[PDB]
Amino acid sequence: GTFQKIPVALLTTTGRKTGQPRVNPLYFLRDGGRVIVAASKGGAEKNPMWYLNLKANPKVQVQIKKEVLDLTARDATDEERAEYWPQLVTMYPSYQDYQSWTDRTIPIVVCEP
């Protein structure tokens, strides 16, 4: 393994159009039994499909290493974004090179048991 390794969580959501499962690797934080997941970049012309899927069906699966969790996903509240965003930037310093508005558009999703 190289200095370039970036831990990711595989988030599986239910496709909003077909109901088929869809997987996306995302950046994440653990907080007790919560897993916080976020897109790796922002300011997109479109929200990512995994985020639109979990808006329609909050029931998701998160895999970290070989551990599989069934969780229910919801947007971080304003307070939770303020709480988690600095820990995300610490864990993934590539976020530092984004401007303000870019950051405010990143989905930050709390998945809980």
Author numbering: 39 to 151
Q: What does the paper behind this entry write?
A:
A deazaflavin-dependent nitroreductase (Ddn) from Mycobacterium tuberculosis catalyzes the reduction of nitroimidazoles such as PA-824, resulting in intracellular release of lethal reactive nitrogen species.
As expected (Manjunatha et al., 2006a; Taylor et al., 2010), the backbone trace shows high similarity to proteins in the split barrel-like family of flavin-binding proteins. The initial structure was then used to solve the structure of the longer NΔ30 construct by molecular replacement based on a 1.55 Å data set (Apo-1 in Table 1) and of a 1.85 Å resolution NΔ33 crystal (P3221 space group; Apo-2 in Table 1). All but the first five amino-terminal residues could be built into the electron density for both crystal forms (36–151 and 39–151, respectively). This alignment omits 14 of 113 shared Cα atoms because of conformational differences in the same regions that differ upon coenzyme binding. In Apo-2, this helix stops at Y136 and instead a helix forms upstream from residues 139–143, and residues 136–143 display higher ADPs.
